[PDB]
């Protein structure tokens, strides 16, 4: 059914670790991320 | 049951991305022929190179300006109907629909080098109708757009040639069928002006109204839909355009005694010139006077300087009691009033009939 | 293939139904095209202009405005017929000859009202109407008939030789609204055939008269003409003016071209246009009046 | 589909056979349609009238009354063709460009007798006949081509008739199409077809036009501030109408090119659609 796709999509998700240090530094908090990607469309042809 | 036509061209006058499927697309002849025709058909007294000035600036404001002269096959071949409708929008009667389509085609396109392009095309047509190079022999007709493929600034489009409109398969849209779409500015049915019944079969024509004055010329483009006959359309159009016909007959050309032939041939005892002296021995004292007539006619309205319209058959609609629908829908990022024609069979040879009366 | 169905009126007498079955391959006209129609449109009563039967000059205008249709097999109830004008494929089309003149292969067919003796036409007493069928002649005979009819019109406000046989025409001009209209469209064509280049062509009369002799062919051109033969020995034709811009212009080009389009429009606006071409496969080369031929859409 | 078979003659030289193989997509014009025909209908012999070879004015009338066809393929012993006539759905209809001007897409095809230069044609000396092929020009250029050729001939008569020529001029005539000029008939000498085939054409054109702006000048003397007078009118209408039907313009084919080169030069072959 590739002829009915009409702009599909796909997305990711990632997390990051953190270190525990003290002193004259601001504290750290965990961070998360969210990405997204769409699909491309190309065709092929041949004559006869 | 139907046939298709393909052609690649530059996308400076046509954008198959924004244009709706089923709109009219026209093509242009090589611009190099315009000057070769103008310098030989220009009226006496008028400057023949104002068209060249108006034409050079058109391509100067167009991509790849160093590609004019050879015609290798990579020029701006095709164009859209809405393009000319927006170029001459200041002349149509439907004020708001004209200007809406104009701003829409400006915004949906590059919108950076688009306004300049439009004004160049405007005086380009204005100079076209300045030396009798009327733009009804340089604008052909293609069918409604069916499929297109573009990668950058160069597109390959295919359109129907002749036959039923919904007999093709666009095969990438939601449905596999398309109908003819036109801007509401160009649509002009004449039967509802002529006050006759609108039932049965109706033909489709394109007209090119011309106004010829001093430094003020105008050219519209109307898609007429009428039941009138093939040739009777000419007599019908003159009744509505009787004003411009008379205006042109008086402002078209801006750059002597009779002889009683039948009288002096009905009566005898007139100076005769029998063949015996025209044999060719002394054919000057034989024709010394024989008359004078002091006659010459140089400045007179020709049938080409009084022309005001030129039409051509495009297609018919066999289904009686047509039900064309008009509504406003989004065209890019703006809404424009479009009229939707269904079941129209294309055909007919490209022959132009000129209404000079 | 487009066809129109003419519903015959009921309660028809058997004699008229047989006479209607005789009209197998004739031509009828319609004002508005539609699949279903009535017998009133085909009747001559529909041709009325003000309140009366039409005129031969009014008929020439009704023929251009009305659509054309060709009768085909008729059944007792319905009357089948196909369209002509609109582009539509029709396999195996045929027409019945109605003119007294014979036709051959490769002749264009025209359409003119009955100018000869009283038109043979079906008459219906019970319904109260009658239908007149148009007359079909080739192109050459068409242009000669129009020329003499228009000339007789100017006279008010005839013999034609074809294939060594002479005929006559009883033209009818009981109206006046249409007669003066033909005068208008005539002078408008002559007026648009006058440009700056007539002077040159009007100055070549003496060398034409010289070329008339010792040629044996131009004489026939000269005898049929009257004006140039009379003006050739009566006018002086002052020699020549100059050209405004002769360095880049060709003045005799327009006049030789301006006349081409004018003459082509003349044959159609004055009368009718070519509608059909006759080309029969596996048939006789010449058809006789009353017989049918296979014709091709133009 | 209707097709016409032209019977190839026996005992034909191999050189004439090879040249016939070349003219694959050319136009033949048939008098009467039939599945079997002879070469006599194709040769110029069938075209001439009154004994003398045909005239340009006569050829123009020939192309209207006579039906056209298109060769499809030649065979070492047979020759086939298809008709452009009544209803034939000819598949894969291709023609070869015979005119010196180029063609593009969406251009309608008309026909014309050879006027510019000497017509090329195959000549069969063994059988003793030759076959002349018509010219294929676009529609927009046809009306201009005729007006330029006739106007050229009248200029020659004027230069001869007038005691002095009015030579001062713009240079040389030329037809431009797709940015290509044709520069026809450069030299004044070599009057090949000056009065050889367009002689009678100029004559009939020089009389009807002369009758045009003369009859009006002799009927309404207000324009410029014994005698029939009606038979002249009827004769003028009958002539000018017939001459207009002669110099008509009716397209016969349409160049519909798919997946191919848009512009095409003299000598190339393209697929065309039946109009």
Automatic annotation (TrEMBL), chain A:
Transmembrane segments: none annotated. It comes from the Viruses. This is Major capsid protein. It comes from Human herpesvirus 3. The gene is ORF40.
UniProtKB/TrEMBL annotation, chain B:
GO terms for molecular function: DNA binding. Keywords: Capsid protein, Host nucleus, Virion. The keyword Nucleotide-binding does not apply. The gene is ORF20. It comes from Human herpesvirus 3 (HHV-3). This is Capsid protein. GO terms for cellular component: viral capsid. One of its GO terms (biological process) is viral capsid assembly. The chain holds residues 118 to 483 of 483 of the full protein.
Automatic annotation (TrEMBL), chain D:
One of its GO terms (cellular component) is viral capsid. The keyword Thylakoid does not apply. It holds the Pfam family Herpes_V23. GO terms for molecular function: structural molecule activity. InterPro entries: Herpes_capsid_2 (IPR002690). Keywords: Capsid protein, Host nucleus, Virion. This is Capsid protein.
């Amino acid at each position: 059914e590739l002829a009915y796709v009409r702009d599909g999509v796909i997305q990711f998700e990632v997390q990051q670790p953190m270190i525990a240090r003290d002193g004259p530094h601001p504290v750290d908090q965990p961070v998360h991320n969210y990405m997204v990607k769409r699909i491309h469309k190309r065709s092929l042809s041949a004559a006869f | 049951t139907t046939q298709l036509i393909q052609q690649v061209s530059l996308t400076d006058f046509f954008r198959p991305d924004i244009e709706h499927a089923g709109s009219i697309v026209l093509i242009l002849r090589h611009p190099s022929d315009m000057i070769g025709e103008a310098n030989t058909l220009t009226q006496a007294g008028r400057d023949p190179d104002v068209l060249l000035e108006g034409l050079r600036n058109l391509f100067n404001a167009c991509t790849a300006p160093w590609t004019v002269g050879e015609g290798g096959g990579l020029r701006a071949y095709v164009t859209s109907l809405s393009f000319i409708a927006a170029c001459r929008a200041e002349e149509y009667t439907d004020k708001q629909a004209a200007d809406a389509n104009r701003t829409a085609i400006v915004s949906a396109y590059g919108c950076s080098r688009m306004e300049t392009r439009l004004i160049r095309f405007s005086e380009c047509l204005r100079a076209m109708v300045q030396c009798h190079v009327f733009p009804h022999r340089f604008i052909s007709f293609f069918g409604s757009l069916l499929e297109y493929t573009i990668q950058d600034n160069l597109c390959n489009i295919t359109a129907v040639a002749k036959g039923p409109q919904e007999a093709a398969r666009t095969d990438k849209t939601s449905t596999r069928r398309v109908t003819a779409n036109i801007p509401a500015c160009v649509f002009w049915d004449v039967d509802k002006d002529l006050h006759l019944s609108a039932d049965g079969l109706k033909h489709v024509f394109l007209v090119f109204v011309y106004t010829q004055r001093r430094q003020r010329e105008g050219v519209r483009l109307h898609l007429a839909l009428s039941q009138l006959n093939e040739q009777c359309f000419g007599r019908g159009i003159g009744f509505l355009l009787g004003r411009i016909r008379a205006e042109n007959a008086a402002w078209g050309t801006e750059g002597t005694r009779a002889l009683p032939l039948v009288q002096l041939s009905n009566d005898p005892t007139s100076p005769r010139c029998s063949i015996g002296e025209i044999t060719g021995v002394n054919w000057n004292l034989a024709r010394q006077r024989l008359y004078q007539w002091t006659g010459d006619f140089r400045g007179l309205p020709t049938q080409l300087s009084c022309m005001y319209a030129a039409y051509t058959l495009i297609g018919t609609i066999p289904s009686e009691s047509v039900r064309y629908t008009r509504r406003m829908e989004r065209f890019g990022g703006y809404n424009v009033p479009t009229i939707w024609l269904e079941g129209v069979v294309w055909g007919g040879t490209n022959t132009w009939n000129e209404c000079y009366y | 293939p487009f066809e129109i169905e003419v519903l015959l009126p009921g309660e028809l007498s058997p004699a008229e139904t047989s006479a209607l079955q005789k009209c197998e391959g004739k031509i009828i006209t319609f004002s508005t095209l539609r699949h279903r129609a009535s017998l009133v449109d085909i009747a001559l009563s529909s041709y009325y202009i003000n309140g009366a039967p039409p005129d031969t000059l009014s008929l020439l205008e009704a023929y251009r405005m009305r659509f054309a249709a060709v009768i085909t097999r008729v059944i007792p109830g319905k009357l089948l017929a196909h369209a002509i004008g609109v582009g539509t494929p029709t396999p195996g089309l045929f027409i019945q000859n109605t003119s007294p003149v014979d036709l051959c292969n490769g002749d264009y067919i025209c359409l003119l009202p009955p100018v000869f003796g009283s038109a043979d036409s079906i008459r219906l007493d019970s319904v109260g109407l009658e239908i007149v069928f148009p007359l079909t002649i080739p192109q050459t005979l068409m242009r000669e008939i129009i020329a003499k009819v228009v000339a007789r019109a100017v006279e008010r406000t005839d013999v034609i030789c074809y294939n060594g046989r002479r005929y006559e025409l009883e033209t009818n001009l009981q109206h006046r609204d249409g007669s003066d209209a033909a005068i208008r469209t005539l002078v408008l064509n002559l007026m648009f055939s006058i440009n700056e280049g007539c002077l040159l062509l009007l100055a070549l009369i003496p060398t034409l008269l010289v070329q008339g002799a010792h040629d044996g062919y131009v004489n026939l051109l000269i005898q049929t003409a009257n004006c140039v033969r009379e003006t050739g020995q009566l006018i002086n034709i002052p020699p020549m003016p100059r050209i405004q811009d002769g360095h880049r212009r060709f003045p005799i080009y327009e006049t030789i071209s301006s006349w081409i389009s004018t003459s082509s429009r003349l044959g159609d606006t004055l009368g009718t246009r070519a509608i059909l071409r006759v080309c029969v496969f596996d048939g006789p080369s010449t058809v006789h009046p009353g017989d049918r031929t296979a014709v091709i859409q133009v």
